[PDB]
């Protein structure tokens, strides 16, 4: 009556093909706000597009943040500092948009356990991104929001999913990286990774392509972290 969701979706797919991820995200944001549950396709369009869109700002944030530190020259360092801060603001606006879709529309309207974990994982992911750039006083509470989301995702997957399931494994991977990069807790990190790795291999005979990829990443991480 008031708007057209099927045409927004077509426009997201077309934005995708055109490699226009902001355009893309804005369609998927508008689609999520119509309030109906997202099919597996539309969920993926949402994820891919906010992944690309935030991922460019994170990538950029790093490059400019490293250049800021590698110049402990005063005036060129202030330029980099200000340019970093521009980048964080764009980053935060993105994270805030997604977290709102998550908490308001997506999580509460997820009917199956597979999707509830997918969205809670994503909740923790985007809180995590926010914690990568948090200033002192706000950092603690943002980190906690990340952790609680991942935890609540973690437990649902342990009860409701196979340990070889890619989403459970993606959750395990991202959750370990949280512990390692955010909390600076390598023992909890490696243990979470290994435990979730080991349990997957122990049913690697049941399955494949999707799960293996994550298992590889889990492994490369463990390797890097023990050093």
């Amino acid at each position: 009556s008031h708007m057209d969701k099927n045409e927004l979706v077509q426009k997201a797919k077309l934005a995708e093909q055109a490699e226009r991820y902001d355009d893309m995200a804005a369609c998927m944001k508008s689609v999520t706000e119509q309030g109906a549950e997202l099919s597996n396709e539309e969920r993926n369009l949402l994820s891919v597009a906010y992944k690309n869109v935030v991922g460019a700002r994170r990538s950029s944030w790093r490059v400019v943040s490293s250049i800021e530190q590698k110049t402990e020259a005063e005036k060129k360092q202030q330029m980099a500092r200000e340019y970093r801060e521009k980048i964080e603001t764009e980053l935060r606006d993105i994270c805030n948009d997604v977290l709102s879709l998550l908490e308001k529309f997506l999580i509460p309207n997820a009917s199956q356990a597979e999707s509830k974990v997918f969205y809670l994982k994503m909740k923790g992911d985007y809180y995590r991104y926010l914690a990568e750039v948090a200033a002192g006083d706000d950092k603690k509470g943002i980190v906690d929001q990340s952790q609680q989301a991942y935890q609540e995702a973690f437990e649902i997957s342990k009860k409701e999913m196979q340990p070889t399931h890619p989403i459970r494994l993606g959750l395990a991977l991202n959750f370990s990286v949280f512990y390692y990069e955010i909390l600076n807790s390598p023992e909890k990190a490696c243990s979470l990774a290994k435990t979730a790795f080991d349990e997957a291999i122990a049913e690697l005979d049941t399955l494949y392509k999707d799960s293996t990829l994550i298992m590889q990443l889990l492994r490369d991480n463990l390797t890097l972290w023990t050093s």
Partner: peptide, 5 residues
Amino acid sequence: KLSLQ
């Protein structure tokens, strides 16, 4: 270092 693709 490596989160989900």
